[PDB]
């Protein structure tokens, strides 16, 4: 019932349209840290602690 049929006289028949879509995404921020003292390094048994 929706086939674009055409007669020998043509005319303004079977017009169509188009569409488009948009996608999006965003970034975020992360981080963490730790703290220490000089003694916690110098007097510790393991010299490879850091």
Binding site residues, its own copies, CB under 8 A: 3-8, 13-18, 28-35
In angstroms, the first-to-last Cα distance of the chain is 77
Smallest gap, in angstroms, from Cβ of residue 9 to its own copies? 11
Smallest gap, in angstroms, from Cβ of residue 22 to its own copies? 10
Question: Smaller CB distance to its own copies: residue 4 or 25?
Answer: 4
Question: Smaller CB distance to its own copies: residue 1 or 16?
Answer: 16
The whole-angstrom separation of Cα 15 and Cα 28 is: 45
Among the listed residues 16, 40, 29, the one whose alpha carbon sits nearest the alpha carbon of residue 50:
40
């Amino acid at each position: 019932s929706k086939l674009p049929l055409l007669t020998e006289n043509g005319g303004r028949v079977n017009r169509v349209g188009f569409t488009r879509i948009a996608r999006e995404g965003s970034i975020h921020k992360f981080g963490f840290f730790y703290e220490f003292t000089q003694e916690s390094i110098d007097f510790d048994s393991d010299d490879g602690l850091m």
